[PDB]
Amino acid sequence: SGFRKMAFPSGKVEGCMVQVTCGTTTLNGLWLDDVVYCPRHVICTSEDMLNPNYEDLLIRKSNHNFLVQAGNVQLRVIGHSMQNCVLKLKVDTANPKTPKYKFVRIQPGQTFSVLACYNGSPSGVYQCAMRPNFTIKGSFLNGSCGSVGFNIDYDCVSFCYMHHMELPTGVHAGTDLEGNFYGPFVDRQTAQAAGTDTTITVNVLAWLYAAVINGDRWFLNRFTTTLNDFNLVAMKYNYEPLTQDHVDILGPLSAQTGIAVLDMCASLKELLQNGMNGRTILGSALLEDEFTPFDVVRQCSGVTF
Amino acid sequence: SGFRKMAFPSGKVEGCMVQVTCGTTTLNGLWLDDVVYCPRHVICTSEDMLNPNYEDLLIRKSNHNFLVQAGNVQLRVIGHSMQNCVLKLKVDTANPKTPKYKFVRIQPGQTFSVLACYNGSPSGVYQCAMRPNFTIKGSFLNGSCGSVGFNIDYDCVSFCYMHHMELPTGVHAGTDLEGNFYGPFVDRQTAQAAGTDTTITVNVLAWLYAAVINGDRWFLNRFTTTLNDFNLVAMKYNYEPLTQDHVDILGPLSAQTGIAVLDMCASLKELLQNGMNGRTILGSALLEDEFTPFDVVRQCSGVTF
Ligand SMILES: *[C@](O)(C(=O)NC)[C@H](C[C@@H]1CCNC1=O)NC(=O)[C@@H]1[C@@H]2[C@H](CN1C(=O)[C@@H](NC(=O)C(F)(F)F)C(C)(C)C)C2(C)C
Numbered sequence: 001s002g003f004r005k006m007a008f009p010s011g012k013v014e015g016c017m018v019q020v021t022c023g024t025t026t027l028n029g030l031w032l033d034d035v036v037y038c039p040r041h042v043i044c045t046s047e048d049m050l051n052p053n054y055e056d057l058l059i060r061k062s063n064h065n066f067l068v069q070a071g072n073v074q075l076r077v078i079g080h081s082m083q084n085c086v087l088k089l090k091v092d093t094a095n096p097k098t099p100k101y102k103f104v105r106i107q108p109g110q111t112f113s114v115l116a117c118y119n120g121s122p123s124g125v126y127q128c129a130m131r132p133n134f135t136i137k138g139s140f141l142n143g144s145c146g147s148v149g150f151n152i153d154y155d156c157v158s159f160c161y162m163h164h165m166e167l168p169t170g171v172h173a174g175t176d177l178e179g180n181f182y183g184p185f186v187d188r189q190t191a192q193a194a195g196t197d198t199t200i201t202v203n204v205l206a207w208l209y210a211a212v213i214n215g216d217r218w219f220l221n222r223f224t225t226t227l228n229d230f231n232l233v234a235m236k237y238n239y240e241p242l243t244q245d246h247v248d249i250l251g252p253l254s255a256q257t258g259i260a261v262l263d264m265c266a267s268l269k270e271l272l273q274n275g276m277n278g279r280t281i282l283g284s285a286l287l288e289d290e291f292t293p294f295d296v297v298r299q300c301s302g303v304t305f
Numbered sequence: 306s307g308f309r310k311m312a313f314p315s316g317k318v319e320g321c322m323v324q325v326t327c328g329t330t331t332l333n334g335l336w337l338d339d340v341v342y343c344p345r346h347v348i349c350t351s352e353d354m355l356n357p358n359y360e361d362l363l364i365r366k367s368n369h370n371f372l373v374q375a376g377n378v379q380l381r382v383i384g385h386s387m388q389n390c391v392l393k394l395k396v397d398t399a400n401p402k403t404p405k406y407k408f409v410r411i412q413p414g415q416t417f418s419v420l421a422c423y424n425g426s427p428s429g430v431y432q433c434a435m436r437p438n439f440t441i442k443g444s445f446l447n448g449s450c451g452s453v454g455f456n457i458d459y460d461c462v463s464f465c466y467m468h469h470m471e472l473p474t475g476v477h478a479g480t481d482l483e484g485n486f487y488g489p490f491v492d493r494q495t496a497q498a499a500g501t502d503t504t505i506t507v508n509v510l511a512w513l514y515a516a517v518i519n520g521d522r523w524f525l526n527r528f529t530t531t532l533n534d535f536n537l538v539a540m541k542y543n544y545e546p547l548t549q550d551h552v553d554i555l556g557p558l559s560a561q562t563g564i565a566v567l568d569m570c571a572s573l574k575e576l577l578q579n580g581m582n583g584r585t586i587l588g589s590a591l592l593e594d595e596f597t598p599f600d601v602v603r604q605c606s607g608v609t610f
Pocket residue numbers: 026027041049140141142143144145164165166167168172186187188189190191192306
């Protein structure tokens with residue numbers, strides 16, 4: 001029992017982190033086989049970053065201008081190319097610690113672990129959600145760029161996020177490993193704001209199931225609701241619409257607790273309309289939306305990697 | 306910017322986890338050099354655990370009765386001994402992945418990372434505090450026993466916790482790596498309850514400093530207080546006394562923000578007396594006490610390992 005925000009074990013990703021330096025700019029890279037992936041703004045000075053022409057800056061660089069270090073060892077760069085907002089440095093040595101891996105573009109509402117890194121060295125690991133407005137609520141300082149986000153499925157590391165920038169409100173934005181941004185953001189130092197965020201309804205329901213599994217049952221009411229009537233009420237409180245796909249994904253938790261998804265929807269509607277009245281659920285005074293249905297099942301079933 | 310509950314990177318500990326099986330009992334062990342450390346109740350059946358005589362059960366076991374597995378590889382056991390609540394199995398192979406390490410007994414109020422494991426395989430990592438009542442608020446299922454808690458200091462892993470049991474309220478108890486329990490608990494299935502818990506004051510202050518560093522400053526008032534007057538008020542709200550040692554440990558955050566510890570104490574006193582009035586601090590509606598002063602400095606300075 002107990003329910004905690006839990007990250008994936010980071011060891012398979014720790015073995016892939018390197019430092020990339022171009023002139024006086026240093027940030028983190030991800031070394032898989034004989035390629036190092038890092039944010040393309042490694043090739044800018046401070047002044048370049050207000051309106052950089054990356055294609056123009058990269059034409060003036062050659063392989064030897066990229067200093068890649070794996071702990072104390074320099075890796076010799078033997079090719080370079082830009083893909084969207086990511087630089088790919090081919091190196092003469094394959095990383096012997098490369099795990100089985102995939103590059104995946106995640107959907108808003110999905111969670112992942114971030115391995116925050118500085119100078120190619122791991123600082124810490126924590127769990128994030130891709131927000132509906134395409135930001136993450138991270139913890140990132142200057143030097144963190146090229147830190148990565150990932151999921152593990154048994155032996156396979158699915159890389160989904162590379163860190164690039166901080167937006168107003170101290171939220172974060174970055175790319176998939178093909179260098180395409182999540183959301184409407186660009187890698188330029190100019191005024192950019194996230195859209196209005198929305199609460200990930202399907203994740204709040206998953207967490208109420210987690211609360212029932214742990215014996216926190218006070219908020220269960222005697223009512224059901226229709227999907228249509230639930231969605232009209234959720235809309236008012238800036239909750240995402242709940243779709244039939246979301247109901248189907250909640251099926252395993254529903255089956256395990258014996259509580260129909262639309263009965264839990266009736267309980268969530270009463271919490272939104274009436275509040276929590278100074279009570280907590282799983283130790284929280286606010287409804288939590290950064291646990292997916294799969295995160296709840298993994299943690300409450302002891303899935304390992 | 307941003308502030309998150311962050312765990313240590315787990316890779317150095319992931320390379321030490323093994324499975325130990327004695328009869329039909331399986332749990333996790335920690336393999337350092339040529340020794341495997343695990344909870345001594347690996348040698349009990351279900352029925353033994355209501356009132357076990359561990360010395361008696363262990364005299365009837367020999368080396369070959371302990372099945373240790375490191376992934377697919379069986380490690381041959383060549384000696385065994387009991388130290389307090391921990392079994393030590395000597396094996397014929399040194400773990401080539403053994404990090405620089407120490408065994409340390411932590412103090413209440415200190416934090417550590419737990420690597421939750423099942424069948425010798427990592428499931429997840431999260432950050433805990435040793436509560437004043439010698440429990441942790443973990444997430445542990447049947448099969449998690451012998452999961453470990455640790456801190457990292459550059460290259461050195463300080464192991465502080467081995468998991469043994471779950472108490473009422475879904476809190477957790479275990480031993481240091483010398484097999485001595487934290488708190489008054491015993492490894493027997495009998496009625497045991499944690500004492501009344503208390504809030505770790507020095508950690509709440511550390512987190513209010515973290516809030517100021519991140520630009521959440523609404524709760525700062527124009528007052529100071531004396532250590533004596535603060536402690537009389539804290540006592541009422543089941544906060545630990547703040548000692549001069551605690552004030553000295555808060556010195557670096559105090560110096561960085563320019564806010565004297567006793568001025569922050571005046572702000573905390575007003576939050577305890579008046580509440581938060583539906584506002585949040587660093588996104589939380591409750592005062593958080595599981596960040597140490599050192600956790601705040603590491604995260605807000607980007608300390609790496
Ligand atoms: C990253 O370049 C790094 O760590 N380099 C060593 C850095 C990470 C960033 C700094 C503070 N916390 C973080 O997450 N990223 C940047 O500095 C990016 C680079 C330049 C401007 N960057 C920003 O993050 C801007 N943000 C914006 O301009 C805004 F508003 F659009 F988001 C700030 C103002 C420096 C935070 C790039 C976008 C190329």
